[PDB]
Design an enzyme around this catalytic site. Structure first.
Site, mmCIF file in Angstrom:
data_model
loop_
_atom_site.group_PDB
_atom_site.id
_atom_site.type_symbol
_atom_site.label_atom_id
_atom_site.label_comp_id
_atom_site.label_asym_id
_atom_site.label_seq_id
_atom_site.Cartn_x
_atom_site.Cartn_y
_atom_site.Cartn_z
ATOM 1 N N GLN A 89 28.237 34.576 47.022
ATOM 2 C CA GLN A 89 27.954 34.871 48.431
ATOM 3 C C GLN A 89 26.991 33.892 49.086
ATOM 4 O O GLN A 89 27.150 33.526 50.241
ATOM 5 C CB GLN A 89 27.385 36.275 48.561
ATOM 6 C CG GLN A 89 27.081 36.691 49.976
ATOM 7 C CD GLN A 89 28.324 36.901 50.796
ATOM 8 O OE1 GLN A 89 29.128 37.783 50.503
ATOM 9 N NE2 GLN A 89 28.493 36.094 51.833
ATOM 10 N N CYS A 133 27.253 40.086 55.381
ATOM 11 C CA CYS A 133 28.193 39.845 54.313
ATOM 12 C C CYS A 133 29.316 40.879 54.199
ATOM 13 O O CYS A 133 30.215 40.724 53.372
ATOM 14 C CB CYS A 133 27.468 39.582 52.990
ATOM 15 S SG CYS A 133 26.737 41.016 52.307
ATOM 16 N N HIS A 183 23.849 37.592 43.563
ATOM 17 C CA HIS A 183 25.192 37.467 44.114
ATOM 18 C C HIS A 183 25.375 35.972 44.448
ATOM 19 O O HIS A 183 25.436 35.582 45.620
ATOM 20 C CB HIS A 183 25.321 38.327 45.375
ATOM 21 C CG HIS A 183 26.736 38.558 45.802
ATOM 22 N ND1 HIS A 183 27.812 37.997 45.145
ATOM 23 C CD2 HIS A 183 27.251 39.293 46.813
ATOM 24 C CE1 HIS A 183 28.930 38.375 45.735
ATOM 25 N NE2 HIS A 183 28.618 39.163 46.751
ATOM 26 N N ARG A 225 31.909 41.295 37.447
ATOM 27 C CA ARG A 225 31.285 41.940 38.599
ATOM 28 C C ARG A 225 30.842 43.319 38.153
ATOM 29 O O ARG A 225 31.643 44.248 38.009
ATOM 30 C CB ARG A 225 32.322 42.092 39.686
ATOM 31 C CG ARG A 225 31.902 41.576 41.001
ATOM 32 C CD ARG A 225 31.837 42.714 41.906
ATOM 33 N NE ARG A 225 30.875 43.651 41.383
ATOM 34 C CZ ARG A 225 30.682 44.847 41.907
ATOM 35 N NH1 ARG A 225 31.411 45.225 42.952
ATOM 36 N NH2 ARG A 225 29.715 45.630 41.445
ATOM 37 N N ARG A 238 34.021 32.434 51.540
ATOM 38 C CA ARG A 238 33.786 33.014 50.243
ATOM 39 C C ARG A 238 34.879 32.539 49.283
ATOM 40 O O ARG A 238 34.673 32.473 48.078
ATOM 41 C CB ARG A 238 33.889 34.521 50.403
ATOM 42 C CG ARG A 238 33.184 35.305 49.376
ATOM 43 C CD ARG A 238 31.885 35.839 49.917
ATOM 44 N NE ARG A 238 31.733 37.244 49.545
ATOM 45 C CZ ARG A 238 31.727 37.715 48.295
ATOM 46 N NH1 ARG A 238 31.858 36.904 47.232
ATOM 47 N NH2 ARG A 238 31.606 39.029 48.123
ATOM 48 N N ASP A 278 22.288 43.301 56.420
ATOM 49 C CA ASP A 278 23.203 43.975 55.523
ATOM 50 C C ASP A 278 22.978 45.484 55.573
ATOM 51 O O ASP A 278 21.955 45.957 56.061
ATOM 52 C CB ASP A 278 22.986 43.445 54.107
ATOM 53 C CG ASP A 278 24.116 43.804 53.164
ATOM 54 O OD1 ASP A 278 25.197 44.250 53.642
ATOM 55 O OD2 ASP A 278 23.915 43.630 51.941
#
Lengths: 335, 335, 335, 335, 335, 335
Positions: free
Chosen positions: F137, F273, F134, F107, F320, F231
């Site tokens: 996600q 998210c 991502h 990450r 997730r 977001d």
């Protein structure tokens, strides 16, 4: 493998000689396996409904213990919680229960109820007792006789004395006929099994090599026999006061030391499927003894015979569990 | 190892002080083991018959839960399916059941029935209750007292108020006598245990260092005591209308706040083996309250005492299970 | 994780839409897991008390089988061994039982009894049935409808015909309202749920998007519906002789082929929570047929409808077990 | 069974005397079980989030080891990866975490944060420390005292010297009050717990039989006491240069050999929850020793007392793990 | 059996030749067992604290993976959560941690800190690195050399070039001396290990048959050698701008293709304990390349050598895990 | 079997429609299996390194919990202990780690770093997040949408409002395009994904039947859509004081009740998210509210929408974990 998977046990009428011998063998082996500690559980996670329309502690306990030994669970449905026919049909009950349980045991009255249960449940159904038959008891009786004898099944002779126009007389005759055994029934002519039924047993006997002898003479029926069987003939329904005639009529068929002697065999054994009225030690027995002072030492069997080495009734009662286990295992196990 | 394998539990009369202490220790340890998650099952594959001649939910549930925790199975035989003595003798029943089950529990009336069961079953037999004794309850009571006290067993004092000429008075006196405890019984002289029985307890007390005090004065019996015990004395058999005299006679022995105070100990606790009649919240209690407006706040114990920190009756009730488990384990386990 | 651990099941009134959907999902998955052989036991060593104030074989068997599948044990306390309120308060019973068992199921009469049980037990409590609600049945009904439909829950329409002023009418309306379903109730105005209760369901319906329609016109209530539900309205308490008026009054709400046709949907299915009086095959049914020759082909539902592909009552009855398992697992499991 | 399943641990304020004793018992038993090798894992497959807003190695390690012993897994969220309140609310964090983990531990500042966490997580929440309370430490302290004493809990006396207007003073007073213990607090009047808080403890003390004594005289507070407790009062936040007054003010409450002697008990023990400033062996301690040459042999406790048989601080520190395990097990286990 | 149970690993100074060979053998076997799938877990339920005063991903990951493979758990205590000496002494920390964990790993600065940890923890202590020694790395180095060579340990020659007045130079010399290996150190005289330390290695060498050669001439030190070792000598502490002299001084000891050729062995291999500065691909490396354009192709080793079959640094890095596992297993396992 | 063993997860660009559907199916099934208690561990003895160049509690916790559920172990390497590029190249780090661990999660920032990791590790590599993509996600988002919808994947419409020139806009467009979904992006033209990237998604869309609509008009983009996504667009890097323009520019794309209404669908749901800035309850949020009083009720989404049934962000966050588990299982399991 040779198997009887998904098979019901409703009367033994549609079980061949090879099938009955398999079950006798399996009973013997499962019995030895429990005592030896080699028993393995093959009914793990099986749920069995035990419906009892009439209380029967010996059959109930036999089914419970067998199931538990094998790892299954049971739901006991008592006479109060059970009234198939009153508020809901057996066709409906069978359909619901067949969807929750893996097998169903039924102990009631009308044989056709058990057959209706079997038609609609969708899972194996066992008859714990009806008016017409008592299949589990018969397998238990033959096994007991078999292990308490040196001859093979077809060499065994046995006599049942008392009232034979019932599920015991009907059943004792049928299993002897399917196994080529020498079976004798001593009873008043009116208390014999139906002719239509004897006729079907004659049919099986001719295929197995058996000899069925019905007669009213007890000493004749018991000559050279290996086992003397009997059962309570006294009517618990009718008040003790109204028994005088039936007692008068059935008393000569009573199993006492004399009949035991009359077999002319020092090896002969006594059998009774219990409970037996062999004394006054009971409350009912104390009353009987009153109205009939003569029956103070036993009714269908006497205390002499009952509390002697002749009596193998308790082994016989134990064999009722090993036998039902053979039924559960052959029918439901993963083997 | 020191053990009590294959031992029956019929009255505690033939259990030594060392044996009772072992059982108290085992109960404590099995209790801690369940709560701690360290319990191991040692009754796997054991089948136990629970015969209840009279319904007793607390004893029944205690036996069921204990057996299940330990991996055993149980067959509950209810009062309807059970009438030992009527149609079949206990000698016969015991012989059949002893052949299918690994141990038998009996809860009935005549102590000699349990002793006959034990003579003929061939497997361990436990007395769940009779008119003469209640062994399981006593072990549960002492354990409770023991864990709710800072002194060792022989330093504990306790008083039981009410009708003592029964299995509770008989039992509370006996276990105190076998363990060298200071036991007091406050009751009308007519309601005391039989002299023949007190005489046998005096015998045990002289061997253990105990002091048994029987008296009719409650405040005297409760002075400096650690636990006050009582039980329903009111006769459920006799109609509420005919209780006037027994109430008149037993009312001074009632456990109220005053008696709780009269102990002169702020640490003293209350015990009752349940069910207790501590109010009118019941249907029977509402009737009693009518004929006797005075008993509207409790009969043998009052709501004040019952719904207060004095009351440890529920822990006491829980300890009935941990205790029977100790009985099952010491008697039947592979340890 | 999202969970409902240590939660009671008393009425569904305090269960959100997300909670009910979770339970419906879990039921579906546990069902598939049993048939697939992927089920794992997560109630091993759990002991559950089943108190039945009134015999209920279907609910009892559903709880027994679910518990057993999951590895738990059960103690069935029958109507005879159970009289909460008579000799001992539910507050006392709950306190003792909560100390021996891991969860308690109660099936009785007054809802407040179950709520008192829940207040004092200290362990999860499940309502197997009361006069006001039948929570387990509702989850079973929706699941059945859900798996026998192609639309999502909020797209399903259903009608219940018959007496609605009871735990079935009360419950069928409540679960439809919490799940945003189109629910219709066809009944005489006097037999509708209390206005106070409908008012609370209107409250839930406005939060979920549901439409609750109460009406006295059956053909109107059944138009374009997916499932037709009904139940026995005939009073088993009142002698068959005194039923004339209630039959007269409730007969137009009977589910027959005509009502089945009136839905205008060839896909519609029939539901009944059983037992159903769809013929004279019963003993009670044979009497009814006498006093009322017209009810010889069914009372609330006719044999035509009952013994046809319309009837999914048996799947519905099976779903009662998978559902209670979801309740036991979500509440008590280690997951 | 008596249980505390799904219960949070936020302050001990809503935990009864019976609940705290249960936890003390469980701690003792789980401790003995680990050393004995009888421990069984009942948290297998449980995932626990440990959020630490402020580094706390002893609490962290205690939680990690306990969880691991029991078969669970942990996710340690450090002070850097954790800033509840800055970029995201605790209500949001709690909702996400409650969906991935089985329980959440929180160690931070504002008690209301832990209470908000508990309101929204949906899973059990444990308070590892806040400004107001330190629940885990208190259970660890009482257990230590309990196993290092011959008297029962209510017979134990203890004194805490130092700054009491904090989570240690607040907590030491509260647990003594809930358990009927004789608790004394020696501190300057300004450093006493809030009156509102003492008032609530007086409330609990009157229900448990405790005696709470607050005083400014240390020798008086320590007379005939069993355990002397203390803690670092020196402000690590304020530079060593600005400590002169607080030292002047708190120095008379320092635990030295004299105070240890002043208890008048040769059995008395010393307790400190660590880290303790008992010498100059540290880097901070070497600085302190400079500005204040007098504090070269210890600040709140002296090296004499610290490195002597009086000191049981390390057993006390070990008991922090056995205790949290009791919390995890009682709350989350399958027992 | 021959064992090293409960043994610490602080420097290798008190480990005999037989002990080191046992560990080398065990490493080899545990390595083969993991790849073969025959590994068995013998650290199940062991909890290990990993204290890192300075971040060391390779040592940390090696310990984590080893522990996990063997079934143990670890608590990683980072540089932020760890400041032994600041607020609390290592004597205190060791006493607390030794009571919660089964073994402690320490990676810090002063060797005496690790020795203090070992004196007071009460459980095995491992040194992950200090200024004086790096025991785990040495076992990893010899094993790598051993498996990448055809001669037995005492037949292996190796040279380490660079700064030797540190834990690498100190350690590489010590393990060669305890194992009778031909070890050469090429470094400026000022950067040689202390004479007092070389003197102790000469002592071990005379007991094992080894030859220790210290010299300032690299081509001489590398003649006929099997492995060329080196390490970063450039000071990360001092700003890149102030490195000119140390680079000037240490540059001739750089491992390039020429030195690799100068060994006169086509089988010779290169070793570096990593991280290595073999190019400009890094951010630090890009800066270095600026101030010193010459070091654009590597500093202590060049990209040519590093990215060639000569380089076995990654196998060497893998062997760090198999080796620590041998340490954990020999020290803590049930074998 | 159809499988994705040893496969990396770097962007989803090289994952076919069949592969993504397989993963969606596996996620759904693994989710049901955990809640149902049928989950089996297939990563036992797997060690996974989690490298986080930037703290990400939600992704970290999702990976930890998934791994633990499946029986694997994890080593969390934080931002401090991780600086790939500074002192050591990712090529070197990957080579060492690939030799100790079974899979590596990364990450960070530059996508090419993850691709370099994947080129050299030798074990599966997962991208937990970069500037470009991502992947984890997206799978979580589609699954959530899929289970909160009645239409199949290709029938679902969704709109993402806000800044789209990033890993969220890039990713939301890509997964919709690979699955033939109707995806709309409402954003200022400058904040749209690169044309080169949209062009590649148009390529995938033409192969799957999707419709990608980019536009600057939000009400147009949200018409008849099933899910509204957004977001945080506000720059946490730039001081709150310098946000005036970006807020001015992005404010019309804010998700409020009006936009929720403008979808013209009462079934539409909201997705974010997280973390979301839906109020002032935060410390940053309280500052924002100051400089911009208007943003006191939410920035990208308002409290009205956020704390309403529209919001499914928490289910989305739970998904997730189930999703990454599908990644770990499909990639590393023995199935």
């Amino acid at each position: 493998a040779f198997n009887m998977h998904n098979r019901n046990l409703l009367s033994l009428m549609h079980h061949s000689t090879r099938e009955l011998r398999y079950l006798l063998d399996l009973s013997r082996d499962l019995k030895r396996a429990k005592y030896t500690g080699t028993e393995q559980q093959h009914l793990k996670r099986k749920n069995i409904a035990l419906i009892f329309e009439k209380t029967s502690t010996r059959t109930r306990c036999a089914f419970e213990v067998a199931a538990y030994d094998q790892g299954a669970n049971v739901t006991y449905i008592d006479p109060n919680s059970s009234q198939i026919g009153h508020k809901e049909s057996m066709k409906d009950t069978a359909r619901v229960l067949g969807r929750m349980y893996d097998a169903i045991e039924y102990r009631g009255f009308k044989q056709e109820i058990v057959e209706e249960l079997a038609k609609f449940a969708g899972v194996p159904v066992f008859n714990g007792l009806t008016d017409e038959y008592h299949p589990t008891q018969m397998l238990a009786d033959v096994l007991t006789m078999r292990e308490h004898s040196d001859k093979p099944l077809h060499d065994i002779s046995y006599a049942y004395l008392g009232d034979a126009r019932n599920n015991m007389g009907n059943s004792l005759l049928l299993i002897g006929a399917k196994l080529g055994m020498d079976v004798r029934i001593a009873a008043p002519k009116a208390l014999w099994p139906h002719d239509e039924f004897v006729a079907q047993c004659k049919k099986f006997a001719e295929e197995s090599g058996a000899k069925l002898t019905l007669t009213e003479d007890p000493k004749e029926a018991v000559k050279g026999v290996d086992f003397v069987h009997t059962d309570v003939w006294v009517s618990m329904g009718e008040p003790v006061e109204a028994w005088g005639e039936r007692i008068k009529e059935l008393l000569p068929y009573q199993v006492n030391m004399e009949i035991m002697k009359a077999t002319g065999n020092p090896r002969a054994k006594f059998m009774h499927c219990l409970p037996a009225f062999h004394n006054s030690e009971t409350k009912v027995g104390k009353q009987i003894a009153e109205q009939y002072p003569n029956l103070a030492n036993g009714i269908e069997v006497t205390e002499d015979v009952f509390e002697s080495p002749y009596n193998i009734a308790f082994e016989q009662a134990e064999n009722r569990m090993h036998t039902i286990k053979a039924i559960l295992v052959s029918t439901l196990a993963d083997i």
